[PDB]
């Protein structure tokens, strides 16, 4: 797969040329914002359970037809598979984040998932909403000011939101 560092190289290699000062900088700077990225992955990984539980609570209070008998999420059986799903997606975002590149995410997760739910007859738009909910939960927590050395992360925070959104499109 690819991380933000590999990505830059891959491109440079395609044109078979060395890195332009520009590229070096871009990267060095990322390393700089390193710490931020790690508190990010950490904080999220650490609350995966909560993040899910809540986005789900929301999701289902928002779209309450999925829990009505017949609703694609009806019966413990499906409920579990649903949550499992979410957690799975989150798990891949974290990777993408740590990597600073959606590479992995797309390849080992997003790729063809749209079709998957379709074949299964699972509302691909309702899966997008569940994601959206996780982004919000995920961000609030990652970016929380308490317990951490005050500094700016809006950028990283935006970057993260992207991956989340990226995925929520792939299905909807």
């Amino acid at each position: 797969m690819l991380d933000a560092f590999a990505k830059v190289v891959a491109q440079a290699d395609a044109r078979g040329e060395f890195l332009t000062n520009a590229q070096f900088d871009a990267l060095s700077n990322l390393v700089k914002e390193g710490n931020k990225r790690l508190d990010a992955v950490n904080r999220i990984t650490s609350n995966a359970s909560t993040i899910v539980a809540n986005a789900a609570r929301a999701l289902f209070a928002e779209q309450p037809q999925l829990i009505q008998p017949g609703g694609n999420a009806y019966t413990n059986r499906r409920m579990a598979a649903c949550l499992r799903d979410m957690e799975i997606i989150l798990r891949y975002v974290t990777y993408a984040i740590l990597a600073g590149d959606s590479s992995v995410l797309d390849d080992r997760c997003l790729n063809g998932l749209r079709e998957t739910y379709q074949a299964l007859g699972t509302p691909g738009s309702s899966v997008a909403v569940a994601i959206q909910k996780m982004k919000d939960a995920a961000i609030a927590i990652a970016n929380d000011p308490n317990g951490i050395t005050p500094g700016d992360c809006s950028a990283l925070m935006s970057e993260i939101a992207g991956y989340f959104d990226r995925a929520a499109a792939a299905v909807a």
Binding site: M1, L2, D3, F5, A6, V8, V9, A12, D13, G16, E17, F18, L19, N21, F24, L27, S28, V31, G34, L38, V41, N42, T45, A48, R91, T94, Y95, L98, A99, V104, R108
Partner: protein, 162 residues
């Protein structure tokens, strides 16, 4: 390809679990060492020709016949000349990637892969390179830990060449 990060994200995935604390500590270390490696990388990048054309003669000089012994796999022609030149640069342009990447991953997937059949099939002497490598190995004028890093991937290459 493969870097200290992709490494970790890989393990967590093949175990279907969120990242471990260790793996996290790993990226950290990766970042902490990055600094020197990066700066190193640039320095080499800023001295491409001075090194390429440098190691160029180094191989042309030590193994002279490659300047007259007629043959596709020889530089006895503005062609082989250009090619043995094309090649030399490739290697350099590869060690940098490794520095910028924080691992050997880039060399492994772009150059290291199938290096044998290639040298074989086109009849290209591995010593031909290990010589030019040596050249750069001590003309990159690096010190501190940047030199540590470069002469690291340098050897790695030599290794895979023998």
């Amino acid at each position: 390809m493969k870097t200290p990060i992709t490494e970790a994200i890989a393990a967590a995935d093949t175990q279907g679990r969120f990242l471990s604390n260790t793996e996290l500590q790993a990226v950290d270390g990766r970042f902490k060492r990055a600094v020197a490696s990066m700066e190193a990388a640039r320095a080499l990048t800023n001295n491409a020709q001075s090194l390429i054309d440098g190691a160029a003669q180094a191989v042309y000089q030590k193994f002279p016949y490659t300047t007259t012994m007629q043959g596709s796999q020889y530089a006895s022609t503005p062609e082989g000349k250009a090619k043995c030149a094309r090649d030399i640069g490739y290697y350099l342009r590869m060690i940098t990637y490794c520095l910028v990447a924080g691992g050997t991953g880039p060399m492994d997937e772009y150059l290291i892969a199938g290096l044998s059949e290639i040298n074989s099939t086109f009849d290209l002497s591995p010593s031909w390179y290990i010589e030019a490598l040596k050249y750069i190995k001590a003309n990159h004028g690096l010190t501190g830990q940047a030199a540590v890093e470069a002469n690291a991937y340098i050897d790695y290459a030599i290794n895979a060449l023998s």
